[PDB]
Amino acid sequence: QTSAVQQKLAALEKSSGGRLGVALIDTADNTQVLYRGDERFPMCSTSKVMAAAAVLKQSETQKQLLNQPVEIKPADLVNYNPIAEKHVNGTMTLAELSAAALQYSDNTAMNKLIAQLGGPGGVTAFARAIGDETFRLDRTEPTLNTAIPGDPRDTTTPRAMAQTLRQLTLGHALGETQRAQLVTWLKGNTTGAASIRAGLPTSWTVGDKTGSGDYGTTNDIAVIWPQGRAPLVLVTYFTQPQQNAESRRDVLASAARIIAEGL
């Protein structure tokens, strides 16, 4: 069937000129709302959630892992790395790298998380270990953002990422303390106010991770605590036909508003 919400998302997508993917899980009733839910989209920096979570899982068997220092050298700097560049020729801990990756979208920090996991495939392996058969990380920063239409590298589907984000943040994919740390990090994101958050009542609390890349790719993955009801998990992915297209965070906000109005 096509629901009223799905019809509204299709009308938003038509007006945007791009390709929109949405997955909602309402954790009160476990119901889902999908739009292009099984199509692949480039993750861009939304993949930082999986990498940080994989390091948190490693930390469950190593009490001191998150305090371990990692060297930051000049050649490690990539295109966007406001936190890491301050520690060049010095160190950051894995906790500091996780926080920088998640809350500031620092790409050097992501590369250190990927390296801790043995390369992109270590992130994919963690995804598989927690039941996500769809996610794939194939490259490091910055090339994971090429976002070429039809390219499977560094993609997932909205359905898979919503399910995984639920398991990570609200379920038992991580230990208790690690889940709480991931939630704290997401809630302190600095980059999200124009994306999903912008489409929702301001009283609701959100933790999210944005992404952006070539082809005007504009993404957000969120957990949401509405006032008065069980949490929601919402994924909004958007990508456009032109390599040089501009970001469209407003489309994500519009998708979130349609979802919220449908509840």
Site residues for K ion per CB under 5 A: 45, 80, 105
Q: What tokens appear for 154 in the block?
A: 């560094």
Choosing from 15, 16, 45, 212, the catalytic residue is 45
- Looking at the Cβ atoms of 163 and 217, the one nearer to K ion is 217
**Helix pair angle (158-169, 176-187), 10° resolution:** 120
Per the CB < 8 A criterion, the answer to whether 197 and 208 are in contact is yes
Q: Please, what is the minimum distance in Å from the beta carbon of residue 113 to K ion?
A: 13
- Looking at the Cβ atoms of 105 and 157, the one nearer to K ion is 105
- Looking at the Cβ atoms of 5 and 114, the one nearer to K ion is 114
- Looking at the Cβ atoms of 213 and 231, the one nearer to K ion is 213
Give the residue nearest to K ion (CB): 105
Per the CB < 8 A criterion, the answer to whether 109 and 97 are in contact is yes
- What whole-number distance in Å separates Cα of residue 220 and Cα of residue 234? 8
- Taking every pair of Cα atoms in the chain, the longest distance, rounded to a whole number of angstroms, is 57
Q: What tokens appear for 34 in the block?
A: 């999908």
Per the CB < 8 A criterion, the answer to whether 205 and 183 are in contact is no
CA 52 centroid distance within chain: 10
Per the CB < 8 A criterion, the answer to whether 84 and 106 are in contact is yes
Residue 3 annotated among the catalytic residues of the structure: no
Q: Please, what is the minimum distance in Å from the beta carbon of residue 83 to K ion?
A: 11
DSSP letter assigned to residue 224: E
Q: Please, what is the minimum distance in Å from the beta carbon of residue 258 to K ion?
A: 26
Beta bridge pairs of residue 26: 31, 232
3 state SS of 161: helix
Q: Please, what is the minimum distance in Å from the beta carbon of residue 103 to K ion?
A: 11
Per the CB < 8 A criterion, the answer to whether 84 and 72 are in contact is yes
- Looking at the Cβ atoms of 132 and 141, the one nearer to K ion is 141
- Looking at the Cβ atoms of 35 and 80, the one nearer to K ion is 80
Per the CB < 8 A criterion, the answer to whether 42 and 150 are in contact is no
Q: Please, what is the minimum distance in Å from the beta carbon of residue 46 to K ion?
A: 10
Q: Please, what is the minimum distance in Å from the beta carbon of residue 218 to K ion?
A: 12
Q: Which residues participate in catalysis according to the annotation?
A: 45
